Amino acid sequence: APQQINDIVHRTITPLIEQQKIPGMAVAVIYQGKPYYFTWGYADIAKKQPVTQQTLFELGSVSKTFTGVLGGDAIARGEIKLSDPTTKYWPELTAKQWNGITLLHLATYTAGGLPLQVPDEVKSSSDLLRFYQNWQPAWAPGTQRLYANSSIGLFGALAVKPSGLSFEQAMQTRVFQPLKLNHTWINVPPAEEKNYAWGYREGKAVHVSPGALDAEAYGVKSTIEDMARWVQSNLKPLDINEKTLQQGIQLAQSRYWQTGDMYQGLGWEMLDWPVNPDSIINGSDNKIALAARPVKAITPPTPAVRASWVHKTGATGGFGSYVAFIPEKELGIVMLANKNYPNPARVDAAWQILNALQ
Numbered sequence: 108a109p110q111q112i113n114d115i116v117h118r119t120i121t122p123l124i125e126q127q128k129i130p131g132m133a134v135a136v137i138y139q140g141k142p143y144y145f146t147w148g149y150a151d152i153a154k155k156q157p158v159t160q161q162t163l164f165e166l167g168s169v170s171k172t173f174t175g176v177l178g179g180d181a182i183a184r185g186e187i188k189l190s191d192p193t194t195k196y197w198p199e200l201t202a203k204q205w206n207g208i209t210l211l212h213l214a215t216y217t218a219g220g221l222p223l224q225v226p227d228e229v230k231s232s233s234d235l236l237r238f239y240q241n242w243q244p245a246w247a248p249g250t251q252r253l254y255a256n257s258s259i260g261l262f263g264a265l266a267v268k269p270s271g272l273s274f275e276q277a278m279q280t281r282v283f284q285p286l287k288l289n290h291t292w293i294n295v296p297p298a299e300e301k302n303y304a305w306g307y308r309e310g311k312a313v314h315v316s317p318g319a320l321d322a323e324a325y326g327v328k329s330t331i332e333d334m335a336r337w338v339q340s341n342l343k344p345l346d347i348n349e350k351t352l353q354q355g356i357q358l359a360q361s362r363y364w365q366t367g368d369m370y371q372g373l374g375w376e377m378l379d380w381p382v383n384p385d386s387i388i389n390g391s392d393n394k395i396a397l398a399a400r401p402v403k404a405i406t407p408p409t410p411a412v413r414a415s416w417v418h419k420t421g422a423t424g425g426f427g428s429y430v431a432f433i434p435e436k437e438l439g440i441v442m443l444a445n446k447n448y449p450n451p452a453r454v455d456a457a458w459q460i461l462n463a464l465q
């Protein structure tokens with residue numbers, strides 16, 4: 108724990124926790140490929156349980172990075188192709204608006220306006236078929252980007268079908284295990300409950316509620332140690348022994364579309380380093396992050412650019428997370444909190460910290 112890291116982290120995080128009234132928080136700073144941990148406050152205010160390196164946090168949308176990579180792994184295995192139409196893996200989708208909508212589109216939120224949230228009323232697998240069949244695009248495929256759980260979530264569900272495995276089983280076997288993320292779960296087992304932090308929303312303790320496509324779009328829980336390890340894997344996919352997993356990771360960082368100065372990958376979103384902090388900070392605000400925007404296809408997709416600021420925000424009703432790394436610098440950071448505080452404040456803290464380290 109070099110004093111340099113120690114100092115920036117505390118100079119930055121301390122005012123952050125106090126300004127946003129964050130109950131508990133864990134931070135991992137990956138400097139030169141090595142992880143450094145810091146923890147603050149409570150995992151459970153009522154039971155006086157402190158946040159520790161073993162505490163599980165709801166990752167929220169950061170879960171999409173795992174989905175993008177698992178999907179990339181499927182492509183690498185030859186099981187699916189991003190150019191394949193959605194209907195090849197779901198022949199039941201017969202509504203004409205699906206012609207021309209590929210897995211690339213679902214994966215990158217460019218199908219033409221799929222909503223951010225899957226309606227609450229959608230429960231059964233037939234309830235989901237009905238939803239997609241009736242959904243009407245506001246735009247032609249591959250022309251507009253609208254960040255949505257219903258889009259990349261569907262991608263994740265379809266991507267694992269050829270494997271014959273269930274989404275959780277596929278995730279575990281192909282991503283969590285190889286990478287030794289042994290305290291990362293889609294479903295927290297009873298044995299681990301004691302490490303599961305409570306999220307906080309307006310003073311009330313809450314955990315994520317079951318929902319359609321939840322596992323695929325925002326349902327992973329993890330500890331600061333595993334997330335640090337997840338960052339290390341996306342920083343250096345070459346150190347990864349499983350051939351298809353290594354490719355998948357790289358495929359998740361390929362640049363498929365560009366909007367503003369941001370490029371869409373599979374789950375991960377990227378910008379060229381050096382970046383203008385104002386651009387990632389203001390751009391992380393939902394004002395922009397959830398807004399519908401025109402996208403320029405990158406034909407063909409640019410392979411993962413090492414000099415990139417790669418990141419993803421994440422949130423549930425009671426949690427707020429952020430992951431950002433610069434491959435070229437072997438530099439990264441993970442910020443986990445059991446409070447959904449504003450994205451801009453997250454990115455600003457990560458920026459000050461990482462910028463201070465090169």
Ligand SMILES: *[B]([O])([O])[C][N]C(=O)/C(=N\OC([C])([C])C([O])=O)C1=[C]SC([N])=N1
Pocket residue numbers: 167168169256315316325420421422423424425447
């Ligand atoms: B991801 O975290 O970017 C997607 N997030 C969500 O789907 C959830 N909340 O995001 C919104 C609704 C924009 C918010 O209020 O911040 C979400 C999933 S489960 C849950 N309770 N909230």
